[PDB]
Amino acid sequence: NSVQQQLEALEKSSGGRLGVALINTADNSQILYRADERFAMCSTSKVMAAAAVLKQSESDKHLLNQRVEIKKSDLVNYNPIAEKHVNGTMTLAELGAAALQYSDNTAMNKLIAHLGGPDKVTAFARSLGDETFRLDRTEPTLNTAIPGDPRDTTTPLAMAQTLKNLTLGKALAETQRAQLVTWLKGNTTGSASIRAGLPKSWVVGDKTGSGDYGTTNDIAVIWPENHAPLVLVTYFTQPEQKAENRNDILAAAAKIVTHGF
Ligand SMILES: *[B]([O])([O])C1=[C]C2=C([C]=[C][C]=[C]2)S1
Predict the structure, then answer these.
(1) Which residue minimizes the CA distance to atom 8 of ligand 1?
(2) Which of 39, 41, 75, 78 has most ligand 1 atoms within 8 Å of CB, for mutation?
(3) Residue 44 contacts by C-beta under 8 Å, 6 or more apart in sequence?
(4) By residue range, what is the domain housing residue 169?
(5) Domain holding 208: CATH number?
(6) Which residues does the entry assign to the active site, renumbered to this chain?
(7) What is the total count of domains within the chain?
(8) Helix 247-258 vs helix 3-14: crossing angle, to nearest 10
(9) So which residues are the catalytic ones?
């Protein structure tokens, strides 16, 4: 079976809708499966918010160390890092780290608020040539992931292209690019997702996302030991609101598309 046939079969068994975009930076070849279809990003959108702040920091050398007050009222449904800092402050850098490496929702909301709202995150994506990404809501409602709802969505290909630009390419100045990569490499939430489908010693940076409709996502930059990087987006969503999330599908898709590298 071809890679396409394997992906189609995986989707068939899965009980959902699978979206994959792999970019092989050796030759810009791509493996695409529903790669132009929209999916709710869920926490994969945290990358765009953090990157928007990194972009601002290129022209404001004091920005990343700017204190942000964390109040009890700021806490939302998931605040593993921010809850430790209630009544204190976190810097914008610390909020970027928490949003990316722990998927902290308070951190995401502080980034969005700092930027001036979801529409400003969209404008940042557009400035990178991403015509597809849209952020519409804050946490936690941006994760409703209702089938057919365009809010807080992108496509696998758009997000793969933008993640490539952000981490390996032209989007950010070097220090900021390196910081984003450091953050992604230190992610703590992705063990069972794309990473689980790859050779154990490959270096990976990723951001997971999950939401309602069993929406289960991961976006990754992958550095093989003897090959150019790969950029991989695996998005997955299901028809029923209370579907279980399925990181195993993402691992399986990653294994299918990285065979041979
Ligand atoms: B993200 O990782 O997709 C997240 C979304 C929510 C989290 C916690 C609570 C509610 C939504 S993490």
Answers:
(1) 78
(2) 78
(3) 159, 207, 208, 209, 217, 218, 219, 235
(4) 1-261
(5) 3.40.710.10
(6) 43 (acyl-ester intermediate)
(7) 1
(8) 170
(9) 43
